[PDB]
Design a protein around this nucleic acid. Structure first.
Length: 543
DNA sequence: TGGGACTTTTTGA
DNA sequence: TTCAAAAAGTCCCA
């Protein structure tokens, strides 16, 4: 809740250098560089140093070209503090610290203590740098969210993040021909909520460079994945984007004195993306991956959304009140008609699900409060207060002992395919035990009209293959290190096929399932069967 | 302290 | 009425 995050000095140096590398101080000796979330001025002090070097090295040229008495080395500090540096933040103390630092670098200092999203900006800016705040839909005040929805509807909507509005504000107050460079989360590149935002960035600025750190850790002790976006508003004929994607997420960012050394090394991969060819999604991949993805998309006639019905797991609202161990003695109080098997994301393997260790009390079947009063008095009631603070319980839609978002039972108590919402690899398992789960596991079942065309065994055989792992990870949402988001908004967009290899792929999947379900489970032959199935799928897809 | 295993429920629509 | 997205994730240990 402090609101101030230290951006590493390497990133700050890289961003400032990216914005001010090729600035013609002779042509324009009055550049306006702004940081709308400056905090203690990590970016602004480096901006001051760079500007001081520029002015000191061109002071005599400026003196000849302009007022001789005005352009002096002794007057550089005052000029920079008067006409060049602009900062804004909400923290009074951080603004005071930055003001003290700028004063002690050697006068009206242009530092503002306000909300940058509400401030009426009196002029546009040549350069904009900084690190905006990241606040999700849970940790954001509701009235402020209403304000954002009312005024920033072009980029902010539904489950959008706060920094979308900061992106929009940076684009709005950027002078024509100006350059902006910021560090933000990487999720908006692939997230559904970022769609509108991406469109905005596509339709108002030219994207110069995207530095994607994927799942690395740039901020110490902070669970966020970061990217650096550099863009301009110049008159460009061809709009191409230099995309730099990290290859090894196990790095210490201080491996080099400069970020450019890391970018131009074997630790990063560079390619080019045509901005005019960008779709609703931004598919930032190299030529090989692009050809692979296009070949898979063309060769497949169906998608999972076409043939399957998907749903999210139960949302109890308070798991500690409804989930218990199968060996718990309190379960003797509850009849088996109210008990469902309960699995977690770690219980999902590639083809089969681990046997259930937990039981869920489906309290929605409790008809009368007086009946089964022992269960409410000794199990569910222990968290009654918490259960009463849920949104649907304050409004009277749910009884305090009911599940907040208990779905239809008929969807879970059937044969279906389940997969964790976050994983390092594809894990699509067939559930035979009518397992219930929380939102950490998503489920789907084949529509009855496609049962003859696609079976569960074939689907899990092709989905768990390395080919489809790579194919899904092309457009997947990279959350953290070795973690991808497996949500319906991208899982249901996977495209599938059927051809002459359907029978052998299904048979190999059945053999793998049979081996995995045996007692003396030696998974060695499973790998060989998987390799054979991968070769079959690669032959089928022409790759 | 840094790195790996694992993942709740609040929330807008 | 009731769906599904969202990591400035969360938590523990050598």
């Amino acid at each position: 809740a402090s609101g101030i995050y230290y951006t590493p000095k390497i990133i700050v140096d890289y961003i400032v250098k990216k914005t001010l590398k090729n600035h013609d101080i002779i042509k324009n000796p009055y550049p306006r560089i702004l940081d709308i979330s400056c905090g203690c001025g990590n970016f602004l002090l480096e901006v001051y140093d760079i500007l001081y070097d520029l002015f000191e090295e061109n002071i005599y040229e400026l003196k000849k070209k302009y007022d001789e008495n005005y352009w002096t080395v002794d007057n550089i500090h005052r000029h920079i503090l008067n006409y060049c540096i602009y900062g804004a933040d909400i923290d009074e103390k951080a603004i005071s610290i930055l003001k003290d630092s700028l004063t002690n670098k050697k006068i009206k200092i242009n530092l503002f203590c306000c909300d940058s999203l509400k401030k009426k900006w009196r002029y546009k800016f040549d350069y904009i740098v900084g690190n905006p705040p990241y606040i999700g839909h849970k940790k954001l005040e509701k009235k402020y969210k209403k304000f954002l929805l009312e005024k920033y509807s072009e980029v902010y909507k539904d489950k959008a993040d706060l920094y979308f509005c900061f992106y929009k504000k940076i684009i709005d107050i950027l002078k024509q021909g100006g350059i902006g460079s910021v560090i933000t989360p990487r999720y908006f590149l692939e997230s559904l909520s970022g769609k509108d935002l991406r469109e905005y960035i596509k339709s108002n600025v030219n994207v110069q460079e995207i530095v994607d750190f994927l799942g690395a850790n740039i901020f110490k002790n902070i669970g966020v994945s970061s990217c650096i976006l550099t863009f301009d508003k110049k008159k460009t004929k061809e709009t191409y984007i230099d995309v730099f994607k990290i290859k090894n997420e196990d790095i210490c960012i201080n491996k080099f004195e400069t970020l450019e050394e890391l970018l131009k090394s074997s630790k990063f991969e560079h390619f080019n993306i045509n901005q005019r060819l960008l779709s609703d999604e931004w598919i930032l991949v190299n030529k090989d991956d692009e050809t692979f993805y296009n070949k898979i998309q063309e060769k497949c006639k169906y998608s999972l959304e076409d043939i399957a019905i998907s749903f999210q797991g139960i949302i109890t609202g308070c798991d500690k009140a409804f989930i218990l161990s199968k060996d718990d003695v309190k379960l003797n109080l509850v009849d088996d008609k109210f008990l469902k098997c309960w699995i977690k994301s770690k219980n999902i393997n590639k083809y089969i699900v681990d046997k259930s260790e937990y039981r869920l009390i489906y309290s929605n079947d409790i008809d009368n409060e007086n009946t089964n009063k022992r269960i409410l008095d000794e199990i569910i009631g222990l968290y009654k207060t918490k259960l009463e603070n849920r949104r649907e319980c304050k409004s009277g839609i749910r009884k305090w002992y009911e599940l907040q978002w208990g779905r239809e039972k008929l969807f879970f108590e059937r044969k279906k395919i389940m997969y964790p919402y976050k994983s390092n690899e594809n894990r699509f398992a067939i559930d035979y035990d009518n397992n219930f789960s929380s939102a950490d596991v998503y489920s789907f079942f084949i529509k009855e009209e496609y049962l003859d065309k696609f079976s569960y065994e074939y689907l899990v055989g092709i989905l768990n293959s390395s080919v489809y792992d790579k194919y899904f990870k092309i457009t997947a949402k990279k959350m953290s290190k070795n973690i991808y988001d497996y949500y319906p908004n991208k899982v249901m967009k996977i495209r599938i096929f059927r051809d002459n290899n359907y029978e052998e792929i299904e048979n190999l999947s059945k053999q793998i399932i049979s081996i995995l379900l045996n007692k003396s489970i030696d998974k060695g032959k499973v790998e060989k069967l998987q390799i054979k199935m991968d070769n079959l799928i690669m032959d089928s897809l022409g790759i």
